[PDB]
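Record type: ASSEMBLY
Status: queued
Input:
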Amino acid sequence: AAATSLVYDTCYVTLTERATTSFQRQSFPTLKGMGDRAFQVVAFTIQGVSAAPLMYNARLYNPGDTDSVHATGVQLMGTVPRTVRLTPRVGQNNWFFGNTEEAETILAIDGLVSTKGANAPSNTVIVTGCFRLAPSELQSS
Amino acid sequence: AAATSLVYDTCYVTLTERATTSFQRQSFPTLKGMGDRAFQVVAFTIQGVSAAPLMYNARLYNPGDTDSVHATGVQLMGTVPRTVRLTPRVGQNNWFFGNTEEAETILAIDGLVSTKGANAPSNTVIVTGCFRLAPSELQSS
Amino acid sequence: AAATSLVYDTCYVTLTERATTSFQRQSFPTLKGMGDRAFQVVAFTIQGVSAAPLMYNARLYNPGDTDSVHATGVQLMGTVPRTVRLTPRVGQNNWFFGNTEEAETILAIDGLVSTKGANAPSNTVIVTGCFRLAPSELQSS
Amino acid sequence: AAATSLVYDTCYVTLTERATTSFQRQSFPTLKGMGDRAFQVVAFTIQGVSAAPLMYNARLYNPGDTDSVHATGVQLMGTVPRTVRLTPRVGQNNWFFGNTEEAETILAIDGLVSTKGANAPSNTVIVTGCFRLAPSELQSS
Amino acid sequence: AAATSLVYDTCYVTLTERATTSFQRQSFPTLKGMGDRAFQVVAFTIQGVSAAPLMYNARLYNPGDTDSVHATGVQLMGTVPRTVRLTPRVGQNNWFFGNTEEAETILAIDGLVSTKGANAPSNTVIVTGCFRLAPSELQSS
Amino acid sequence: AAATSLVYDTCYVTLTERATTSFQRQSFPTLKGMGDRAFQVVAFTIQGVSAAPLMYNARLYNPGDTDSVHATGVQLMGTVPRTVRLTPRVGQNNWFFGNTEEAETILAIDGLVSTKGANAPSNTVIVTGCFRLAPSELQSS
Amino acid sequence: AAATSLVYDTCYVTLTERATTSFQRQSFPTLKGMGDRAFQVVAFTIQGVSAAPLMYNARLYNPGDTDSVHATGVQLMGTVPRTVRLTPRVGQNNWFFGNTEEAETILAIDGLVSTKGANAPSNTVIVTGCFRLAPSELQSS
Amino acid sequence: AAATSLVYDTCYVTLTERATTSFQRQSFPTLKGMGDRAFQVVAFTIQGVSAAPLMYNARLYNPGDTDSVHATGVQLMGTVPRTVRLTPRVGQNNWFFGNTEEAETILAIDGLVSTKGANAPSNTVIVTGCFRLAPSELQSS
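Status: finished
Output:
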């Protein structure tokens, strides 16, 4: 066999009102420095708190796509941390090859407000991805 | 036999944004004044509240190490108290000898903010450690 | 919780007759670039082939030690690949802190010949380590 | 596999009143001359007799520590032999590497008297350690 | 909850013929330096040896009392260690408040001889108390 | 062990209308002359008869208190003997130390009449206490 | 029999930062005006809310003591009401005699802040005690 | 009913070589001061230690007899405490009336040596009697 590995990587961000923040290969410490080894998204856990009403939508991408294939749907944020899980099903699951560029988008989170022109209040979102890794593509001596 | 004792000790702190607060042997009242008796960390219960979004990461140390071997991973804080438990497994569990210096680090908690240059809002973290104690190393008359 | 990860990393080498080759943190691709996150050795699988009689001894280290605490014992190599598993038990298992230096020795393999002054024949050894990872020690913004 | 060995080694001493006698690697015949092979303390059996009231405290050490992590607690000695067993639990159990120096302390026994300035009466303590041994680290030809 | 702790503390003494030795809060290392935290006596284990015939009577006190409420009753001592357990029942069990003075008597042991005017022979008594501790009364910042 | 003893002691009295009669340590024959030995109230049996309507209230004391912690509540007396049992529960049960003064109050019985200024008719009350005794605190020779 | 009664009494307060508020006999309406009748603490339910991070420690007293014998341990307060129960065990349970002074302390609650010199934010604590009552000590006509 | 009480009383002595020591009503603290109340011997527990070989014979008496009706038979004493129980059977059991004189013999212990003219070495014997008590014979007012 080839033993597939299972790694949890976490990143955090402050969301901005009419913007989307991209979580790329380089946003996750382990994926960023592991070298030439393929990976697949198993699940994402998104945790967020806000000082006042705010919404977000976490969207998952297949490799190379210009838009997402899965999403949590808009979620409300309150003053106490709340956790949402995003699990892809067959077809929203394609493996990223070992050489995927560091800037390749894996998950994008949109920041949304309901009042026209309003600013996002202070907030923090923690994203933890669970990734399955294929064996390394090693070079010869 | 030697009867091992089980003691709960608590300490509290206000976290600061780009700083880590160390909980040393002297931070725990009983460990601080018990004399020459070895101890082991059984578990830590961390409870925190914040007036606005804030994160922390509680990290456990083995004796003499310059960095931690276990951690809760970054945690979000909200306006209602929330409890997290940190339990070491084999290898993150070495016993501290009776003479460990009062300034020896046992647990360190990092204060983190998601917005560049932001200050930590008012917050309080209560740390309760459960320690196993070996018999005292008494002196002769 | 903190989710502990399980990663398999592989490295290969040609053994030399009266020398020991060290497998350091940097010898394993994932451990090398993952950043500040603690890890523990779960098991090592050693696979070797040789063009003619040769022996090796794979030795496991606890963090910071100048000599090993576990070993496979001398093993013979033949012309067909053969696999040996090295699993530490309690006490040969201490966790390496997140900041362990890249040059820190984890496993060392000695190359041995039975005839005085003989050279090692062509050989290859593949080492696959299974490591448990603690959550990352992330920096604040 | 590597077959771990189990060896019992014994040493005896006369305790002195305000002194501690160290049982080092060299105090145990087999550990002393076995060469480069790692070992772990499994258990210690301490047997003592005294011509008049006397106390002792047997303390176990992890490798390299300057003070002990386990102890029997003070024990009374009478005119008939009495046996006490000292068994380390996880964390008071680290393996000693093969090259541990002959003068490395494994167990220390303090001699204690209850009357200020009194001398210890004639006494004898027999210490039998049970050690687990790893395979030898052999040199190449 | 409040987690109650369970601690074993030991002290030793040489008994004198027509005198009583008091074991105060300060006689027990942990109770002595733990600060402002209430405690209750769970049990006492008394172990004694003597070079010649001698008796003792171990007496337990409730907080603030000028005489004891429980006792082992007179016990004989011989040349081999002998253990007696003293366990209070309801009413001989009141909790000592956190601020109890260091000189407060918890257990007193009388030394007795049967021959008029005789001196006590060489002897040693080891007292191990098992105490239940309430949470610490911490000060505000 | 220490064998706890169980003793029944009885005393009788004639109640007076606006007065309370105290049953002290010296009111009970055995408690009065037993010496330095602690005791606890297990139960009291109160039996009374009166030539005409009369009431009483039997009240139990903990050691050193200036008022009672338990009571039968007012009881009516008639021309035929009637028995009431007073059993303390946890907390109304503290042990009296061996040296409690002979004049220390254990039980007090108030004599009550319902008509303003009336005198108590001829009456007799028999009080039988059941006491648990600790071992004696003996003096040395 | 004597029927023991069970009464719930409630009091509320605003905590102050480096101060302790005492809940005395007079703080509880029923205990305050019931007259000469003994009582025992069965349990306390403490409920608190705060506009920002704040801590408290609720401490239980036995009658006449100058410091407490039981405590909840420091508790965090958030923006949503939270309930903690304090139940005494044997020995932290002594009955208060009927005549206990109105100013006698039963429960004390310390207000604590984690930042040096900080003031307590707006807060409210509701304390409900459950008390067992003995029969009244009535006077004669 | 009449409730019979059960009391344990203890006395100690040093035995002398060709002499018998009498344990009279006055030798037992409770029996000595209880007043006019009948009693019966239930059992005697004799515990003795000696610095060198010595023998004793404990003999039980019925009221008013000039010699004993029961005995332990000669017993050897060594350097470690040893316990012997003496339990009367029907007929060696007569009750002592309430007014028995303080000097009335209940148990006698003979000190014996085996070498002609030898002296008894240092020794101590603890005697604990278990007595059943009848109700007190109270006087009228």
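Annotation: The CA atoms of residues 50 and 78 of chain C lie 5 Å apart.
Annotation: Chain C has one domain: 1-141.
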